[PDB]
Design a binder for this molecule. Sequence first.
Ligand SMILES: N[C@@H](CCC(=O)O)C(=O)O
Lengths: 49, 49, 51
Amino acid sequence: SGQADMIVAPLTINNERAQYIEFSKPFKYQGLTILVKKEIPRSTLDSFM
Amino acid sequence: ELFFRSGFGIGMRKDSPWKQNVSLSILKSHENGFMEDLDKTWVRYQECD
Amino acid sequence: GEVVMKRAYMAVGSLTINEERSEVVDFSVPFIETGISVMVSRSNGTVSPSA
Ligand SMILES: N[C@@H](CCC(=O)O)C(=O)O
């Protein structure tokens, strides 16, 4: 819409977006992951018995 | 595992005169090791164990 | 050289995109990420020091 002459952001290269705008060569190669929670180790040993 | 491996690009309009020079200025920064510096100072921290 | 010398339209294969080639040929979007990597033999016995 003319509000910006460029997009400098983590904007992934897509098929739909490529039809309307021209992406540069990627400056960062990556993919999609899943983020989940973590636990600190405890050894879960109740006692010496 | 990584899925949908699509990189980050600098979006511009299809009529832009900078598209040729922007991509070349990104490929050059990849070979010169500049984009590995931006990885070091911003992405590669690793903080805790 | 084939694409530059007009002998072919495309050069599908393991052509890596770099700066000097792209100034004489017109690449496409990468279909797989590559670069430069170092291949070394597997390390021998490496129990963590002072464990
Ligand atoms: N894959 C490289 C050649 C092999 C190498 O990395 O030396 C290229 O397309 O130019």
